[PDB]
Design a binder for this molecule. Structure first.
Ligand SMILES: CCCC[C@@H](CN[C@@H](CCCC)C(=O)N[C@@H](CCC(N)=O)C(=O)N[C@@H](CCCNC(N)=[NH2+])C(N)=O)NC(=O)[C@@H](NC(=O)[C@@H](NC(C)=O)[C@@H](C)O)[C@@H](C)CC
Lengths: 99, 99
């Protein structure tokens, strides 16, 4: 699809068998999701944003559907204001920015 | 142009007669620029994201040159760690997400 930006580019994602809304974010290196239960072990990761840094839990090889496209990769879980799909997963679904 | 997301989508803009590197951020509602002087009246605003909030100065009807295009709108100025081009200006140059 082609998504204009007059509104926030929010899509439905499926992770852990649950449907959630997430923001397609070209300004994010990684994918960060709100607090939830994911399988396996996690490693620490520090990420930064507009207000500063926060600690998140890094889970690798997590299966996640983004707007109907399946992706398998790293998902960071933590106190993020909104679920964001970063470049790591946007590249897996073949997303490009055009103008 | 079609911009792949293997690396951060950075662009050079010209604002206030100054050339600046900026990040095309679909996850950003507004355009936020590092401290600089802009003409006219402004109003304080608090913007948030990963790490919390920062207080910025809001200037309206500011012209920015981006990728040959000369767009106009609201620009927020403050202690942002990265110059961010948000949806407010990305819409004006007709930027869309495609996959
Ligand atoms: C979570 C909130 C929604 C997404 C977020 C993404 N912003 C980018 C901006 C670029 C950095 C300042 C970001 O935080 N990217 C992070 C996301 C986390 C991540 N790990 O991917 C990132 O790439 N961080 C890198 C570091 C980038 C450093 N870059 C650099 N030094 N040049 C990282 N690996 O930690 N948008 C925002 O922060 C914007 N906020 C908004 O759009 C609105 N706020 C909300 C909560 O919707 C508005 C009402 O304030 C800001 C710019 C104001 C308009």
């Amino acid at each position: 699809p082609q998504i204009t930006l007059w509104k926030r580019p929010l899509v439905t994602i499926k992770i852990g068998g649950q449907l959630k809304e997430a923001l397609l974010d070209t300004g994010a290196d990684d994918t960060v999701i709100e607090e939830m239960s994911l399988p396996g072990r996690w490693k620490p990761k520090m990420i930064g944003g507009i207000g500063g840094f926060i600690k998140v839990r890094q889970y690798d090889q997590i299966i996640i559907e983004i707007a109907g496209h399946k992706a398998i990769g790293t998902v960071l879980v933590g106190p993020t204001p909104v679920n964001i799909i970063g470049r790591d997963l946007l590249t897996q679904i073949g997303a490009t920015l055009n103008f």
